[PDB]
Structure formats: C-alpha cells, structure tokens
Amino acid sequence: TATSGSCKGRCFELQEVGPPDCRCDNLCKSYSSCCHDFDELCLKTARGWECTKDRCGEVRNEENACHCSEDCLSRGDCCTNYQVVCKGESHWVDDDCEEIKVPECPAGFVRPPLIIFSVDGFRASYMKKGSKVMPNIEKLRSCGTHAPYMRPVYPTKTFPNLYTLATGLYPESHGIVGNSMYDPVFDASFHLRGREKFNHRWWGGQPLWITATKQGVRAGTFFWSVSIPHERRILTILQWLSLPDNERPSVYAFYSEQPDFSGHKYGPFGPEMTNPLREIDKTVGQLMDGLKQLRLHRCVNVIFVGDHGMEDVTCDRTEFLSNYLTNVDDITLVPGTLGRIRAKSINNSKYDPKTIIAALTCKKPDQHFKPYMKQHLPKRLHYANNRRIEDIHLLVDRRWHVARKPLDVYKCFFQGDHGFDNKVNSMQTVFVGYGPTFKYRTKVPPFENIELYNVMCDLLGLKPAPNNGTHGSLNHLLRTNTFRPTMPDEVSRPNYPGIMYLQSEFDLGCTCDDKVENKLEELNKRLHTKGSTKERHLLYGRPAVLYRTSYDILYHTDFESGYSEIFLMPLWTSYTISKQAEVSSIPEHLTNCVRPDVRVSPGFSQNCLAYKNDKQMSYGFLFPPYLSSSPEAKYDAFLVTNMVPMYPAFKRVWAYFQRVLVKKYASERNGVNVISGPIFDYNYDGLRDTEDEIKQYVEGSSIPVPTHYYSIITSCLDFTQPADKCDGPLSVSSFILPHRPDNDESCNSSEDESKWVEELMKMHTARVRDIEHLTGLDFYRKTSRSYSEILTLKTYLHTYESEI
Ligand SMILES: *[C@@H]1O[C@H](CO)[C@@H](O[C@@H]2O[C@H](CO)[C@@H](O[C@@H]3O[C@H](CO[C@H]4O[C@H](CO[C@H]5O[C@H](CO)[C@@H](O)[C@H](O)[C@@H]5O)[C@@H](O)[C@H](O[C@H]5O[C@H](CO)[C@@H](O)[C@H](O)[C@@H]5O[C@H]5O[C@H](CO)[C@@H](O)[C@H](O)[C@@H]5O)[C@@H]4O)[C@@H](O)[C@H](O[C@H]4O[C@H](CO)[C@@H](O)[C@H](O)[C@@H]4O[C@H]4O[C@H](CO)[C@@H](O)[C@H](O)[C@@H]4O)[C@@H]3O)[C@H](O)[C@H]2NC(C)=O)[C@H](O)[C@H]1NC(C)=O
Ligand SMILES: O=C(OCc1ccc(OCC(F)(F)F)cc1F)N1CCC2(CC1)CN(C(=O)[C@@H]1CCc3[nH]nnc3C1)C2
Ligand SMILES: O=C(OCc1ccc(OCC(F)(F)F)cc1F)N1CCC2(CC1)CN(C(=O)[C@H]1CCc3[nH]nnc3C1)C2
Ligand SMILES: [Ca+2]
Ligand SMILES: [Ca+2]
Ligand SMILES: [Cl-]
Numbered sequence: 001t002a003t004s005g006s007c008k009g010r011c012f013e014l015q016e017v018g019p020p021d022c023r024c025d026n027l028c029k030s031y032s033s034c035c036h037d038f039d040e041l042c043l044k045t046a047r048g049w050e051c052t053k054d055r056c057g058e059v060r061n062e063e064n065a066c067h068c069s070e071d072c073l074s075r076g077d078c079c080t081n082y083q084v085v086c087k088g089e090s091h092w093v094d095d096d097c098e099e100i101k102v103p104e105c106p107a108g109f110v111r112p113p114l115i116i117f118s119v120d121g122f123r124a125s126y127m128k129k130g131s132k133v134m135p136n137i138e139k140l141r142s143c144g145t146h147a148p149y150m151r152p153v154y155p156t157k158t159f160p161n162l163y164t165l166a167t168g169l170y171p172e173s174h175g176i177v178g179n180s181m182y183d184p185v186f187d188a189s190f191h192l193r194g195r196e197k198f199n200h201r202w203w204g205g206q207p208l209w210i211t212a213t214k215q216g217v218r219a220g221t222f223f224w225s226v227s228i229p230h231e232r233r234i235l236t237i238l239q240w241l242s243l244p245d246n247e248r249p250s251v252y253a254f255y256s257e258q259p260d261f262s263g264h265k266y267g268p269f270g271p272e273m274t275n276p277l278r279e280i281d282k283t284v285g286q287l288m289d290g291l292k293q294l295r296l297h298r299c300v301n302v303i304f305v306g307d308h309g310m311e312d313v314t315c316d317r318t319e320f321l322s323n324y325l326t327n328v329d330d331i332t333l334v335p336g337t338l339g340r341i342r343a344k345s346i347n348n349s350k351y352d353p354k355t356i357i358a359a360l361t362c363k364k365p366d367q368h369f370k371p372y373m374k375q376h377l378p379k380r381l382h383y384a385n386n387r388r389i390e391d392i393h394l395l396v397d398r399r400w401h402v403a404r405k406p407l408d409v410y411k412c413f414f415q416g417d418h419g420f421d422n423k424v425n426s427m428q429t430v431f432v433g434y435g436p437t438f439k440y441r442t443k444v445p446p447f448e449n450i451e452l453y454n455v456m457c458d459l460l461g462l463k464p465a466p467n468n469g470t471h472g473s474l475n476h477l478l479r480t481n482t483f484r485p486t487m488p489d490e491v492s493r494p495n496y497p498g499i500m501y502l503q504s505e506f507d508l509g510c511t512c513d514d515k516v517e518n519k520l521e522e523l524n525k526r527l528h529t530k531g532s533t534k535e536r537h538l539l540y541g542r543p544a545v546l547y548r549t550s551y552d553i554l555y556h557t558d559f560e561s562g563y564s565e566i567f568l569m570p571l572w573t574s575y576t577i578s579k580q581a582e583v584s585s586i587p588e589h590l591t592n593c594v595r596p597d598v599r600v601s602p603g604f605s606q607n608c609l610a611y612k613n614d615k616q617m618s619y620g621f622l623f624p625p626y627l628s629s630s631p632e633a634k635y636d637a638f639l640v641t642n643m644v645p646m647y648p649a650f651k652r653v654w655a656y657f658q659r660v661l662v663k664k665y666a667s668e669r670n671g672v673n674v675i676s677g678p679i680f681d682y683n684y685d686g687l688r689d690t691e692d693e694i695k696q697y698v699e700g701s702s703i704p705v706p707t708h709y710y711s712i713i714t715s716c717l718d719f720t721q722p723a724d725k726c727d728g729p730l731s732v733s734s735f736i737l738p739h740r741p742d743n744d745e746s747c748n749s750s751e752d753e754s755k756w757v758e759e760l761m762k763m764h765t766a767r768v769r770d771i772e773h774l775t776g777l778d779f780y781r782k783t784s785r786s787y788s789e790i791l792t793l794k795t796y797l798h799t800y801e802s803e804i
C-alpha cells in the first residue's frame with residue numbers, strides 16, 4: 001500500500017483522494033489508510049470540549065480541540081459554548097421558542113441546510129419517560145413538529161432501518177435485509193463486524209447523499225468512524241458549515257450508537273439508561289448552541305430521528321431449534337429476534353423445507369416463535385422479494401430469542417434487544433422536525449419511516465428517486481411543501497352491461513331454487529340494476545383501474561362491483577352496512593344456489609362444475625348473503641358474478657368475518673362501507689400479477705385462484721355521524737388475508753372462530769396503499785377531503801397494539 005503525505009489543512013476533507021495518497025476523511029480509519037498524522041492534526045483533544053472563564057480572549061493555540069480565542073468565530077472553530085462563557089450569551093435551550101416563519105440565513109445560503117441527527121435504539125416512549133433529563137430534545141420536540149412515534153421497517157435492526165431512512169425503500173428492495181446476510185448469486189456473507197459490508201454490491205437504491213450529489217447539492221459524510229467522539233462529530237459539522245458557499249454542503253448527518261449500546265446491556269428502562277439519555281441531550285445542546293453562534297439556528301432544518309426502539313430480552317427466553325428438530329445440523333440459522341433458515345449444504349437433496357416447517361408448527365403450548373414460508377408472512381412487512389431473504393422465516397414473539405441449540409447461547413450477557421415485528425410498541429421510535437420548513441408546535445399522527453426520504457428530498461429541493469413512500473402523505477408536516485401530488489389517471493374505463501343473455505345460454509352446471517314469482521316492485525328492481533342505490537354503497541367514487549383491462553360495473557340493491565372479464569370475478573365489491581342493518585341467515589332452499597348473471601356472457605363467467613370437479617377448492621361470495629337487505633335482494637348475492645374461489649379452510653375465516661365481524665364493526669363505528677376483493681401475488685413482489693403470472697386455477701378451468709383476499713373498511717372519524725352521511729375526515733382499517741388451504745398459521749384453529757379468526761385478521765392488518773400496489777386500483781377518488789389528507793389516510797395502518 002501507500003501512506004506518506006499529511007492531513008495538514010485537510011482534516012475531514014469532503015472529496016476522497018485517490019492512491020498514491022493517504023486519506024484524511026472520516027472513512028480513512030476503516031481502510032487503514034489515514035495519513036500518519038491524522039490523529040495528531042485531525043483528532044485533537046487538548047483542553048477538552050468547553051470554554052472556561054479564563055480561556056476567554058486567549059491566544060490561539062492550534063493544539064486545542066476547540067478554541068476560545070477572539071478569532072475563533074470567523075475561523076469556524078470555537079468550542080460550542082464559547083459565546084455563552086465569554087460573550088454573556090444564553091444557551092439555545094434557555095431561550096423561549098419563537099416561531100420561525102421564514103428562513104433567517106447568512107448571505108450566500110441558497111437554501112436552508114438539513115441536519116439529520118440520528119439516534120440508535122431511541123424507543124418512542126423515551127420522549128415522555130426521559131423528558132426530565134432531555135431539555136434540548138424536549139424543546140425541539142415541543143417547538144417543532146413531532147409524531148408520538150415513527151414506525152420502523154422489519155427487521156427492526158440498524159442497517160435495514162438506517163438505509164430505509166436514507167432511500168425510502170423497503171429492505172427487500174434496497175437489499176439490506178438484516179444486520180447479517182448471505183447472497184447466493186454472489187456466494188457471499190455480510191456482517192456487522194468485517195470488511196464485507198464495505199463492498200458496493202450490497203447497497204441498492206439511491207440513498208439521500210447520492211440523490212443530493214447527482215442533482216448539485218453537496219453532502220457532508222454519512223459515515224462516522226466509531227472512535228471519533230461525538231463532540232468532534234459536532235465540531236466537524238459546525239466547521240463544514242463555515243466553509244465558503246461554493247464548498248459548503250447542504251445536507252449533513254450525525255449518528256449516535258447510544259442509547260442502543262447501553263440498552264442491550266441494561267434493558268430499555270434499566271437505571272443505567274438515564275446517563276446515555278442525558279449525554280445525547282447534551283450533544284443536541286452543543287449542536288444548537290453551535291448553530292446559534294453561527295447565526296444558523298433559525299436557518300437550519302433539524303431532524304431528530306431514531307432507527308428502532310428496544311425491548312426487554314434475556315438468555316433464559318431463548319427457544320432452541322434443537323428441541324424441535326432432529327436434523328438440526330443440516331441447517332443454518334440466522335438467530336436472535338427473528339429467524340432465517342436455509343440448508344447448510346445445497347448438495348443435500350434430502351433437505352426438505354416442507355418437513356422443517358411442519359416440525360416447527362404449533363409444537364409446544366406457549367411456543368414463542370412461528371414459522372412461515374416468506375411469501376406467507378403478513379403482507380404489511382413487505383419481507384419476501386429478495387434472494388437474500390431465506391424461504392423459511394421465524395417471527396419471534398417480543399421478549400424472546402430463537403437459537404439453533406444451547407451451545408450457541410453459552411459458548412447472561414444482555415438485557416435488551418430489538419428486531420421484532422415492526423408493529424410492536426417497544427420497537428417504535430421517534431421523529432421531530434424543527435426549522436423554518438417544518439411547522440411550529442404541531443403534533444402529527446404516527447407515520448412510517450419509508451415516508452421521510454421524499455420529505456428530506458422536498459426540504460432540499462430535490463426530485464426523489466423512485467421509492468416506497470407515498471409522496472404528499474407527509475405534507476401536513478411542512479410549512480411550505482413544493483410537492484402537490486395529483487391523482488393517477490384511470491387507464492381502463494368500465495363497461496355498463498344491460499340485460500343481454502337468456503338463462504338457457506348458460507351451461508355452468510349451476511342450479512338455484514329461484515323459480516318463485518305488479519309494476520311497482522318490477523320498476524324498482526330495474527332501477528337497482530341501473531344504480532339507483534349506488535350513492536349508498538359507493539361512498540367515495542368507484543376505484544380507478546390503473547392498468548389496461550376489460551371489466552364491467554355491476555349494480556345491485558345492496559352492493560356494486562367492478563367485474564373483471566379477464567379474471568372472471570370482481571376486482572372490487574363495494575357495500576355499506578349501517579348501524580341499524582340486520583344479519584339474516586341463508587334460507588335452506590338457497591344453500592347451493594348459484595345463478596347466472598344475464599348481464600355477462602357465459603364465456604366470461606365462472607362455472608359450478610369446475611368447483612364440483614376440484615376436490616381442493618370451494619367458493620365464497622364477496623358481498624355476503626347474510627347481509628342482504630330483503631329476502632328478494634338476497635338473490636343478487638348468489639349471482640355467479642359475486643362468486644370467488646375459496647379453500648374450505650379459508651371459508652371458515654371468511655364466513656366469520658362476513659357473518660359476525662362486519663355487523664360488529666358497523667355497530668361499533670356507526671355504519672361501515674366495505675370494499676372487498678381478490679389479490680394475486682404469486683411472485684410475492686407486493687405488486688398486482690398479470691394473468692400470465694398465475695400459478696393456480698380451479699381445476700379444469702381458467703378461473704384463477706387468489707393468493708389473498710382484502711377488505712377496506714371505512715367509516716366517519718367523528719363516529720356520531722353515520723358512515724353514509726359523514727361531513728369530515730374518515731377512519732379506515734384494512735387487511736390482506738392469505739388465502740391458505742389450511743389454518744396451520746393459527747394454533748387454536750380447531751376451536752370456534754370466535755377464539756382465533758379476529759386474531760388472524762389483526763395479524764394481517766394492511767394500509768389501503770398496500771392494497772393499491774397489489775390490485776392496480778386507486779381508492780377514494782371522490783370525497784370532499786383534500787388529496788393530501790387522503791394520501792395520509794391511505795398510508796394509515798391500524799396496528800391493534802394498546803397505547804404508548
Ligand atoms: C418499492 O419501490 C421500488 C422502487 O420504485 C419498486 O422496485 C422497482 O420495481 C420495478 C418493477 O418490479 C423494477 O423495474 C424493473 O427493473 C429492471 C431493471 O432494474 C435495474 O435497474 C434499476 C434502475 O437503476 C437506476 O438507478 C440505480 C440507483 O438506484 C443505478 O444503479 C442505475 O445506474 C440506474 O440509473 C435498479 O434500481 C435495479 O436495482 C435492483 O437490482 C439490483 C441488483 O441488480 C439491487 O442491488 C437493487 O437493490 C434492486 O434490487 C431489487 O429489485 C430487483 C428487481 O429489479 C429484485 O429482483 C431484487 O430482489 C430487489 O428487490 C436494477 O439494477 C428491469 O429489468 C425490469 O424489466 C422487465 O419487466 C418489464 C416491465 O416493464 C418488461 O418491459 C421487460 O420485458 C423486463 O423483462 C425482462 O426481464 C425479466 C426478468 O428478468 C424477464 O423475465 C423477461 O423475459 C425480460 O427479459 C423492470 O422494469 C425496479 O427495478 C425496482 N426498483 C428497485 C430500486 O428495487 C418496488 O416495486 C416498490 N415496492 C412495492 C411493494 O411497491
Ligand atoms: O454511497 C455509498 O456508499 C457510502 C455509504 C454506504 C452506506 C452507508 O450507510 C449505510 C447505513 F445507512 F445503513 F448506515 C453510508 C455510506 F457513506 N453507497 C452507494 C453507492 C454505491 C456504494 C454504496 C452502491 N454502488 C453500486 O455500484 C451499486 C451496486 C448494487 C446496486 N443496486 N442498486 N444500485 C446499485 C449500485 C456504489
Ligand atoms: O456514522 C454512521 O451513520 C451515519 C448515517 C448513515 C445513514 C443514515 O441514513 C439515515 C438518514 F438518511 F435519514 F440520515 C443516517 C446516518 F446518520 N454509522 C456509524 C457506523 C455504523 C453505521 C452508522 C456501523 N455501526 C454498527 O455496527 C452499530 C450497530 C448497532 C449498535 N448499537 N450500539 N453500537 C452499535 C454499532 C454504526
Ligand atoms: Ca440501531
Ligand atoms: Ca406480483
Ligand atoms: Cl438480521
């Protein structure tokens with residue numbers, strides 16, 4: 001190699017140098033390529049970090065870590081408390097907050113800088129619970145914009161979350177799917193320790209610093225060597241902000257390994273945790289006093305953001321694959337707060353994932369982890385579409401670990417850990433935004449960390465790279481946006497078929513006992529088929545179809561559907577169930593009733609014979625017969641165009657939802673509007689499948705089998721108003737249930753539906769936005785709400801955790 005040359009006047013230089021030369025940037029330590037004099041010139045420590053009364057007006061001495069001399073301000077290198085100790089100034093924390101209506105920047109600043117202050121393991125409840133010891137953070141929080149918590153991404157580990165913050169992408173798309181990974185195409189392994197993580201090939205997407213660079217905005221570094229202490233990181237950022245206009249970056253990052261580092265040792269609320277929270281707050285204080293000195297404290301936007309929280313976890317709460325598997329040695333486990341399993345050797349053709357899962361399913365009474373094939377994980381986790389994510393996964397219960405065998409845990413160190421399902425309260429983390437671009441004293445609802453990349457791009461005037469945020473859904477955070485989104489254009493307009501077919505044209509092998517026979521009640525049934533009740537059942541406009549297809553709008557007394565001539569079933573079925581609505585049962589004579597739809601050709605219909613011949617597959621209905629508004633209207637629910645294929649095991653789930661839960665939600669929420677439909681995602685990419693991607697059909701037919709069924713359940717946020725007459729904001733909960741031929745996922749399934757079904761639905765809670773990706777549909781096109789507010793609503797997730 002080559003080291004010689006000097007960091008003289010180059011400490012923490014922003015552009016990298018090429019060999020021959022030794023490096024003086026904050027990455028050099030990691031390449032053992034710093035110049036011989038790096039520590040000496042760049043990592044000065046003499047006299048510590050604060051001005052004292054006597055150092056005031058001192059003679060500049062270049063060996064000091066920071067300066068209290070008369071020239072320090074313009075040299076850009078005073079200690080952060082200089083003006084307080086020597087010029088009678090006040091600490092930023094002691095000043096009242098004053099609204100920052102416009103940026104107040106020094107001449108030459110083209111745009112307010114962004115500083116991202118990122119804290120590791122900063123659990124959401126530390127904001128309330130540590131508030132006495134964190135006065136600077138608490139001023140940021142209460143004078144700026146803050147959420148009660150921010151939802152990390154799964155796994156709730158450091159690398160997936162930091163890189164998701166930086167890219168707006170799910171780990172499956174960015175590639176950093178855990179703190180440890182194996183990539184079979186590379187044949188390589190990635191870890192926290194080691195040089196492997198420095199290779200380019202792991203890091204997908206386009207993180208904020210690159211977005212910035214490519215578009216002409218300069219960035220400080222987003223990597224700090226572990227041995228550079230926090231005080232020096234702050235001084236380096238402050239120095240960079242004193243650079244000349246042509247050289248000065250616009251976006252900066254600070255990172256603290258605390259409080260995570262302590263949390264692992266002592267638990268989230270260990271008595272030892274007070275100090276690290278004091279010490280982070282003191283750092284924030286140094287940055288803010290430093291900004292105030294440079295007259296930048298009403299100019300810079302500051303983001304205080306965590307990557308994940310921290311949970312109580314101990315060695316005795318470890319489940320061992322050795323208590324379940326006899327073939328334990330033929331597998332590799334990525335262990336801990338999640339499990340990922342693959343074959344130890346791919347020259348082993350006796351390795352069977354099928355039997356591995358079976359041996360891990362529902363085996364002990366209080367079993368603290370649950371196996372899944374990755375494509376069967378809740379769709380809200382978005383954790384399947386990457387060759388680095390193993391087919392077998394274990395979702396581990398909060399407070400537990402999974403290990404391969406006892407030797408692995410002993411050959412108790414720790415009291416805290418994180419990595420669990422990102423809905424878990426103890427995994428939630430923080431967000432505060434403070435500055436001219438953020439709002440003043442404003443609380444916003446919790447949101448997902450995938451949304452921030454768009455906002456940081458807005459804050460810096462950048463166009464974001466394509467990402468998983470929904471741009472506009474966080475506009476309510478900002479005093480001025482620059483992003484006004486517009487509704488996507490409908491691609492396919494519907495047909496509106498009338499009565500075009502006689503009953504005898506159909507040979508579907510279907511039967512119904514419906515031959516049971518007046519211009520009042522026959523002009524009425526005509527009007528219902530023309531959409532006379534459509535304002536009742538279709539409350540927010542019809543969904544828009546965002547891809548090219550052929551489909552028909554079908555109207556009925558009790559429901560409206562968008563029926564796909566390609567997939568031979570509805571894409572969406574819309575209906576409203578008022579608080580007053582009544583549950584009836586299906587009359588005996590109509591148990592097996594399926595009726596041809598005279599609006600839709602035999603050639604674009606399902607048939608009953610296929611369901612008869614298919615021994616695995618049965619069928620269900622999207623608008624539930626149980627909720628029909630009259631005995632005559634019920635006939636509408638048995639139309640072949642309301643049928644969808646369903647495994648008998650799944651009919652147990654679906655029947656309970658339709659018979660029991662919809663009515664329950666209607667009475668609790670004062671009416672609900674329900675939109676239900678099928679989802680096809682056979683390649684588990686989270687995106688609607690094209691017809692040529694379907695792997696399963698009802699036997700001997702072209703009726704495709706859904707991988708999932710969704711419902712979107714909307715009511716009035718002010719529940720004193722009924723769902724069909726709501727004048728203000730809406731409230732939504734949704735789900736994406738896996739369409740599975742067994743109920744192995746639910747260990748209590750041999751019991752009554754009242755003991756397990758709702759728990760399954762809760763697990764498979766979803767955002768309307770997840771359902772849009774999966775169906776190519778766009779919901780809520782006609783409301784009186786602003787589009788920004790609708791976007792927020794579409795990104796909402798009902799989590800079913802208790803309060804924070
Ligand atoms: C969350 O958001 C993201 C981002 O919007 C969504 O992900 C996007 O989804 C798109 C649809 O699936 C997908 O489009 C693909 O793109 C293929 C080419 O992609 C490569 O280039 C991308 C662009 O690079 C630019 O920007 C980067 C910096 O970001 C620079 O490096 C470049 O210089 C460019 O300027 C690049 O982003 C992408 O990265 C992935 O792959 C890398 C390794 O190669 C990874 O390191 C990285 O992390 C990305 O990995 C993810 O994505 C891949 C799939 O791309 C996935 O397998 C991984 O698991 C991981 O999840 C690539 O380098 C393009 O080839 C595709 O074209 C096929 O389909 C089209 C449809 O229009 C057909 O017209 C065409 O026929 C073609 O088919 C051909 O190929 C077929 C399959 O190989 C074959 O069967 C067929 O017969 C044909 O030969 C398609 O357009 C985006 O790439 C993807 N972007 C990202 C960043 O992931 C995601 O969907 C969102 N999630 C949800 C739930 O909504
Ligand atoms: O700028 C970066 O390096 C610094 C850095 C990296 C990470 C971090 O922090 C990580 C964390 F946030 F987690 F802390 C903090 C940091 F300074 N990166 C982005 C540019 C590349 C190197 C890595 C990725 N490259 C590639 O060629 C990719 C290959 C495969 C791929 N797929 N899609 N596109 C691609 C392109 C060059
Ligand atoms: O300087 C850095 O990060 C800047 C940055 C990078 C990217 C951003 O993206 C987020 C943004 F875009 F929003 F800014 C935001 C940012 F601060 N790094 C310091 C070095 C490590 C990566 C982060 C390697 N490492 C670890 O292995 C820790 C894991 C867990 C832990 N617990 N105790 N000890 C530890 C050690 C920490
Ligand atoms: Ca972390
Ligand atoms: Ca798909
Ligand atoms: Cl991991």
Ligand code: NA
Nearest residue numbers: 611614615617
């Ligand atoms: Na059958």
Ligand code: NA
Nearest residue numbers: 743744746749
């Ligand atoms: Na079961």
